[PDB]
Structures are given as C-alpha cells and as structure tokens.
Amino acid sequence: MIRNIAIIGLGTMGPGMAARLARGGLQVVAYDVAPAAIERARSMLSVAETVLDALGIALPSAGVGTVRFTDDIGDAVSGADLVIENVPENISIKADVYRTIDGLIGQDTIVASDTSGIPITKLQAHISYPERMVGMHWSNPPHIIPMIEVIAGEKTAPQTVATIRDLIRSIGLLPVVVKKDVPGFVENRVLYALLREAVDLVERGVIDPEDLDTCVSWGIGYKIAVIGPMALLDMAGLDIYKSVSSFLNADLSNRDDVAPMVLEKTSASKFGIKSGEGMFCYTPEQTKALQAERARKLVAVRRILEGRE
Amino acid sequence: MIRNIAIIGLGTMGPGMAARLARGGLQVVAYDVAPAAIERARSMLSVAETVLDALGIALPSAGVGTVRFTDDIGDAVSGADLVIENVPENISIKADVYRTIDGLIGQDTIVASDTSGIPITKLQAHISYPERMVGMHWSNPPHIIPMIEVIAGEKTAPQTVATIRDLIRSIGLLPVVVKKDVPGFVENRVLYALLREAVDLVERGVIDPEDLDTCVSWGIGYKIAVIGPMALLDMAGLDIYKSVSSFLNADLSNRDDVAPMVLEKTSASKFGIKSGEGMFCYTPEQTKALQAERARKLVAVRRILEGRE
Numbered sequence: 001m002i003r004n005i006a007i008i009g010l011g012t013m014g015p016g017m018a019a020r021l022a023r024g025g026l027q028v029v030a031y032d033v034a035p036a037a038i039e040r041a042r043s044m045l046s047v048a049e050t051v052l053d054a055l056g057i058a059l060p061s062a063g064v065g066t067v068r069f070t071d072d073i074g075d076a077v078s079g080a081d082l083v084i085e086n087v088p089e090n091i092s093i094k095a096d097v098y099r100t101i102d103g104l105i106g107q108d109t110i111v112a113s114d115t116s117g118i119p120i121t122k123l124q125a126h127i128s129y130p131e132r133m134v135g136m137h138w139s140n141p142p143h144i145i146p147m148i149e150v151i152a153g154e155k156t157a158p159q160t161v162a163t164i165r166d167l168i169r170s171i172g173l174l175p176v177v178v179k180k181d182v183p184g185f186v187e188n189r190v191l192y193a194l195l196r197e198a199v200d201l202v203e204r205g206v207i208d209p210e211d212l213d214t215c216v217s218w219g220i221g222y223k224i225a226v227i228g229p230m231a232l233l234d235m236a237g238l239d240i241y242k243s244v245s246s247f248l249n250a251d252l253s254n255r256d257d258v259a260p261m262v263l264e265k266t267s268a269s270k271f272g273i274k275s276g277e278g279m280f281c282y283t284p285e286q287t288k289a290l291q292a293e294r295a296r297k298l299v300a301v302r303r304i305l306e307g308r309e
Numbered sequence: 310m311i312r313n314i315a316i317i318g319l320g321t322m323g324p325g326m327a328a329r330l331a332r333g334g335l336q337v338v339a340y341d342v343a344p345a346a347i348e349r350a351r352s353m354l355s356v357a358e359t360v361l362d363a364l365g366i367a368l369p370s371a372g373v374g375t376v377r378f379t380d381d382i383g384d385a386v387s388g389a390d391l392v393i394e395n396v397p398e399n400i401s402i403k404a405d406v407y408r409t410i411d412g413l414i415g416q417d418t419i420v421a422s423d424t425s426g427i428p429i430t431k432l433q434a435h436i437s438y439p440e441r442m443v444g445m446h447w448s449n450p451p452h453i454i455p456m457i458e459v460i461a462g463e464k465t466a467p468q469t470v471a472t473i474r475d476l477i478r479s480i481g482l483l484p485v486v487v488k489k490d491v492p493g494f495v496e497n498r499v500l501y502a503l504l505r506e507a508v509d510l511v512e513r514g515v516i517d518p519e520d521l522d523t524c525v526s527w528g529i530g531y532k533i534a535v536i537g538p539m540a541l542l543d544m545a546g547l548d549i550y551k552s553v554s555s556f557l558n559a560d561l562s563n564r565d566d567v568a569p570m571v572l573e574k575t576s577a578s579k580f581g582i583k584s585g586e587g588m589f590c591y592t593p594e595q596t597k598a599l600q601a602e603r604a605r606k607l608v609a610v611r612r613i614l615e616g617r618e
C-alpha cells in the first residue's frame with residue numbers, strides 16, 4: 001500500500017512532482033543534497049500549487065496530502081512506501097542514492113527512478129530486492145504533463161508495475177506501461193525520431209528553423225495533441241499509410257550519431273535557453289516572458305484536451 | 310496579382326479550402342468532375358463557414374470574398390490568377406488537369422498543387438511555363454490547420470514562391486517555404502518519422518496502441534503544439550540533446566519499407582475509420598461523435614495557441 005512517498009532530488013522535476021502527488025492525497029517528504037536546491041524548490045512549489053488550482057485538480061476527501069522538504073535523507077525516507085529517485089542522470093550518483101536508502105526502507109518499499117535514459121535493468125542491479133524497483137518516468141513540467149511512463153526492468157515484478165500504474169490512475173493521472181526496457185522507453189524514442197528528422201531537414205537547408213517550428217507545431221503537434229498517432233493512422237487510412245510509407249520510409253534520415261549542426265552549436269557553447277543562444281536567440285526578459293506564456297498555454301490547452309467546457 | 314482563384318477537386322480538402330480563401334477576400338470558383346462530389350461539398354462548405362466564425366476569422370473590408378461551385382471547368386478557371394489543383398494523388402490524373410487548363414488560363418497564372426507526395430519537379434513537366442507552377446500543400450482540415458507549405462520544383466521561379474507565401478500571409482495564415490523538393494516536403498517527413506518509430510514500438514510489443522497514443526499525445530503533441538522542435542531543443546539544452554542523441558539515434562528504427570503490422574491490417578481490409586476497423590474499432594455512431602469532438606477540440610486549442618484570451 002502506498003500512502004507515504006519520499007522524493008530524492010529537487011531540481012527541475014522535483015517541486016511539481018511533490019505538489020502533484022500531495023494534491024492526490026499522498027504524504028510527500030522531499031530531500032536534496034544541496035541547500036540551494038531546497039530553497040529554490042520552495043518558490044517552485046508555491047507556483048506549482050497555483051497551477052494545480054488552475055488545472056482544477058482537487059484534493060480527495062481523504063489522505064494526508066502534504067509536502068515537506070528536509071535536509072536529512074533518513075528523515076525523508078522514514079516509513080516510505082515509495083521512494084522516487086530523481087537525482088542527476090548519472091548511474092554512479094543514482095547507485096549512491098540506492099545504497100544510502102537501502103538500509104533505511106522496507107524490503108517491500110517500491111523504489112522508482114525518474115531516469116530518462118538509464119535502463120531500469122541496470123539501475124536495479126544496485127539495490128536489494130530489485131523486483132520492487134521500477135521506472136516511473138515523468139515529463140516536464142511534472143505537475144502539468146498528465147502522462148507518466150511505468151517501466152519494468154528485467155527483474156521488476158509485474159506486481160510492482162501494476163501498483164505504480166494503479167497509484168498514478170488513483171490520483172487522476174495517465175499511466176502508460178512500457179513492456180520492454182528499451183533505450184528511451186516510448187516517449188523519448190518517438191520524440192527523438194521526430195527530432196532526428198527535423199534536425200536533418202534544418203541542417204541540410206530544406207527549411208529555416210523557425211519555419212520548421214511553425215510547420216511541426218501546427219501541422220503535427222497541434223493535431224497529435226487531439227488525435228494520437230495510431231488514431232491518426234485510422235483517420236488517414238492504413239491503405240494510405242501503406243502506400244506512402246512504402247517509399248517515404250526509405251527516404252527518411254537514419255542518422256546513427258550526433259548531427260553536425262548540433263556538434264557545431266555545442267562546440268560554440270550555444271546550448272539554448274540556459275546560455276542565451278541555441279537554435280534561436282534569447283534575452284533574459286524574453287526568456288521569462290516565454291516561460292510564463294508557455295506555462296499558461298499548456299494549462300489552457302490541457303483543459304480543452306481533457307474535454308473541459 | 311492574385312484576386313481570382315479556381316480550385317480543381319472538391320473532396321476532403323476542397324470545401325474548407327474554398328471557404329477559407331473566400332473568407333480572406335478572394336473570389337473562389339471550384340470545380341469537380343463528379344456531381345456527387347459537388348453536392349457533398351455544399352454541406353461541407355456550410356459547416357466550414359460556421360467553423361471559420363468560431364475561429365474568429367473575419368472578412369477584410371475589401372475583395373469579392375465568395376465561393377461558387379460549377380460543373381464546367383472553363384467556367385471555373387476563367388480569369389483565374391491562381392488555380393489550385395486538388396485532384397487525386399495520381400500523376401496521370403494531375404497531368405490531365407494541367408493539359409485541360411493550360412489553354413484556358415494566362416501564362417502568368419500561378420498553378421499550385423495540393424499534392425502530398427508527388428514531386429513538384431515532376432508535376433511542372435506537364436504544363437507550359439513551369440516556372441509558375443508550385444506546391445501549395447495544405448493540411449486536413451484546410452480551414453482549421455493554419456499552416457501551409459510552399460514548395461518550389463526545380464523549375465519554379467522564386468517569384469512564384471514569394472507570391473504564394475505573400476498570399477497566404479495576407480489572409481492571416483502561416484506559410485512555410487520548403488527550399489528543396491524532397492519527398493514529403495517537411496511536414497509529412499517529420500510526421501512519418503514519428504509514425505515510423507511509433508508503429509515499430511507497437512509492432513514489437515513495447516506498448517499497446519491506445520497507450521502509445523496517450524503517451525505521444527500528451528508527452529509530445531501537447532508540448533510541441535506550444536513549443537516547436539527547435540525551440541524545444543533550446544529548452545532541453547542542446548548539450549542534453551547531444552548527449553542523448555549520441556546513443557539514442559543509433560537505436561531508433563530505420564525501417565526502409567512497410568511495417569509488417571501495417572501489411573497485416575491492410576491485407577485483412579482493416580483500413581481504419583473508413584472500414585470501421587484499423588488500429589482501433591469503430592461504430593458508425595462513435596465515428597460521428599469522434600469527428601465532432603475532434604473538430605471542436607481543434608478549434609478551441611487553436612485559439613489558445615494563437616494567444617486568445
């Protein structure tokens with residue numbers, strides 16, 4: 001039974017995750033090794049609570065439903081039914097966390113990783129009772145994107161997957177079970193397939209990057225938000241998809257490595273928003289305005305997609 | 310100068326295209342070889358006008374701004390400044406249309422094709438003054454998706470591309486210039502890259518098709534509708550995209566032909582909505598309800614994406 005949740009790591013994905021879980025009635029205690037991170041998480045947490053209000057997400061009529069931050073990991077994981085490990089994408093650091101918490105939690109406590117790219121099969125080699133370790137892969141922002149991937153590693157018990165699937169559904173979120181521990185699970189595989197082709201087209205001068213974005217946002221993302229790919233195939237006709245894919249699949253980029261344009265940008269220290277320049281240029285003011293407007297649009301669009309009138 | 314538009318072909322893409330162009334102030338006369346198609350287009354046209362109202366799209370204070378259907382192609386293309394060819398995806402049929410209209414229109418009339426998969430370079434080999442032939446690739450539904458691709462063939466004059474780009478902008482739509490006549494232009498290349506991976510994951514049992522759709526609609530389409538792929542790379546960090554793509558690109562599907570599952574479905578005459586069964590199952594009632602709800606959500610979401618409050 002999962003009533004008490006500990007979150008380890010309070011960076012980008014932490015505060016919204018904590019807020020969203022507490023809003024579902026769960027008791028959440030969260031920990032980070034860096035005091036600066038815990039402080040930043042407080043402001044991130046208050047904004048997230050308001051966003052949950054704007055999404056119309058209610059506390060159920062039962063459960064603790066609170067969030068607390070602590071600088072003591074023993075305090076955080078004490079009595080936890082679920083520990084969500086949410087530390088950097090580095091297997092040595094994640095293994096450190098598992099070793100630390102292993103002696104402090106019950107052998108039937110579920111340990112979930114928010115990892116995007118490390119196989120659950122590798123992660124669970126670093127904790128006792130690997131059958132209760134599983135991938136629980138949220139998306140950014142975690143209090144706004146309602147879909148969570150649940151991924152068994154080779155040793156994960158089917159019961160572990162079902163329990164986390166059930167937890168996610170119980171608080172009104174949308175779990176998807178990923179049935180093989182493949183690189184990138186499902187979401188980021190499909191995303192990186194989209195990106196691989198988009199980057200190739202920009203790189204070889206087929207289309208300017210801002211026009212690529214207009215094209216794909218409106219022609220693809222807008223449509224797919226309302227109609228998923230399998231449903232879209234049914235709308236287009238699988239006969240049509242057969243006819244077109246018969247020659248178009250052969251012509252798509254099959255790049256096996258990093259695109260030259262991406263190597264060029266990163267070599268020049270152009271990393272995107274974080275450095276003020278990537279594919280596009282940003283001022284600090286524009287960045288703030290863009291972040292606010294994207295969060296606002298995401299919230300409004302989600303309510304429509306959920307059927308709200 | 311483009312004031313008078315003829316549309317040849319009034320199937321799925323025709324009525325909404327005609328309505329949207331007329332709403333921009335243009336005079337539109339449309340033709341179809343099949344009387345049954347012209348009749349169906351009338352009901353499709355009236356619904357489209359209401360959708361344009363719901364989108365808050367106004368007639369400008371000048372221009373003819375009307376739609377008329379005719380069963381005489383000479384009548385339709387008379388005095389046309391732009392003929393949009395919108396007939397089946399079959400180069401012999403498109404060539405027939407170009408031969409028919411060539412003697413009936415000015416040598417400076419622009420002839421645009423709505424083709425998805427036939428190279429503009431091939432199409433323009435079948436009309437006089439190929440420099441005024443261009444791709445103008447709309448998306449379904451054409452009165453709702455605001456983005457249109459403009460594609461030069463090898464012989465297309467840059468002026469032709471600029472004139473159609475300008476026409477699209479002038480009525481409040483979003484043109485994107487595709488700078489090479491590559492298979493699938495940009496939109497359907499990126500879409501088919503997404504689909505190739507999604508189909509592969511369903512086919513090899515990584516995820517159930519309805520869960521694939523939940524995953525991709527919410528994790529990818531929802532996000533990309535608000536934030537285009539190049540902008541999204543900037544948010545994630547190009548350093549991160551470099552690190553991840555360095556191993557993940559190598560693992561993506563590079564399928565060169567039709568997926569076995571798609572061959573299986575089509576062999577069994579399971580084509581999707583049109584036959585009542587494809588990836589999913591549909592009743593006639595469900596189909597109608599789904600079509601209405603998807604159109605309603607598309608309209609509401611678009612207004613948010615455009616910044617409406």
Ligand SMILES: NC(=O)c1ccc[n+]([C@@H]2O[C@H](COP(=O)([O-])OP(=O)(O)OC[C@H]3O[C@@H](n4cnc5c(N)ncnc54)[C@H](O)[C@@H]3O)[C@@H](O)[C@H]2O)c1
Pocket residue numbers: 008009010011012013014031032033034037086087088089090093096097114115116117137138139140
């Ligand atoms: N888009 C995203 O950012 C995103 C989305 C889904 C999943 N993820 C995954 O979630 C995990 C965290 O991602 P993030 O973007 O939130 O990272 P982040 O770098 O923003 O935050 C990581 C946090 O972990 C803390 N930390 C480091 N070592 C620790 C330890 N031993 N104990 C406790 N805390 C420690 C850091 O101080 C930092 O606050 C990664 O595995 C990442 O792949 C990220």
Ligand SMILES: NC(=O)c1ccc[n+]([C@@H]2O[C@H](COP(=O)([O-])OP(=O)(O)OC[C@H]3O[C@@H](n4cnc5c(N)ncnc54)[C@H](O)[C@@H]3O)[C@@H](O)[C@H]2O)c1
Pocket residue numbers: 317318319320321322323340341342343346395396397398399402405406423424425426446447448449
């Ligand atoms: N999603 C889509 O359906 C979509 C989107 C963008 C572009 N397109 C492209 O637009 C074109 C039309 O697509 P559609 O889906 O509207 O096709 P459709 O089959 O729904 O309609 C084709 C119409 O052309 C008519 N026609 C056939 N021969 C003709 C002739 N000689 N003169 C005049 N009319 C004739 C038919 O009677 C029919 O009404 C195709 O090239 C297609 O690839 C389709």
